[PDB]
């Protein structure tokens, strides 16, 4: 039930990543990747492991992180297939890198 202190610091960075500051960047990774919408042929083939912030929430939420390693995972795959499904020029790689920015700085700021 308790969020362990680092699980805690990971919880507000989530508040943070999910916030009106962030969200002219962060909105297209609030909800999984609709492949279908996004005309993103073979999507599901070249991304094996879809991740996005409305999944980390749920397993915060529900508690199902046992450490902020997991978390950090869990961001990080995020970001990283939308980096491997896209090219370099393309506006959600730049938008990903805004708001990977935001996490990777928080993340390091977690308490020993």
């Given at each position: 039930g308790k969020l362990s202190e680092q699980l805690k610091h990971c919880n507000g960075i989530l508040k943070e990543l999910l916030?009106?500051?962030?969200?002219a960047y962060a909105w297209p990774f609030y909800?999984?990747?609709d492949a279908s919408a996004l005309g993103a042929h073979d999507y599901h083939d070249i991304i094996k492991h879809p991740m996005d912030l409305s999944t980390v929430k749920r397993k915060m939420e529900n508690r199902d992180?046992?450490?902020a390693q997991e978390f950090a995972a869990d961001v990080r795959l995020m970001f990283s297939n939308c980096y491997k499904y896209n090219?370099?020029?393309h506006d959600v790689v730049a938008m990903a890198r805004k708001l990977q920015d935001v996490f990777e700085f928080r993340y390091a700021k977690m308490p020993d």
């Open positions: 916030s009106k500051k962030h969200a909800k999984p990747v992180y046992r450490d090219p370099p020029d």
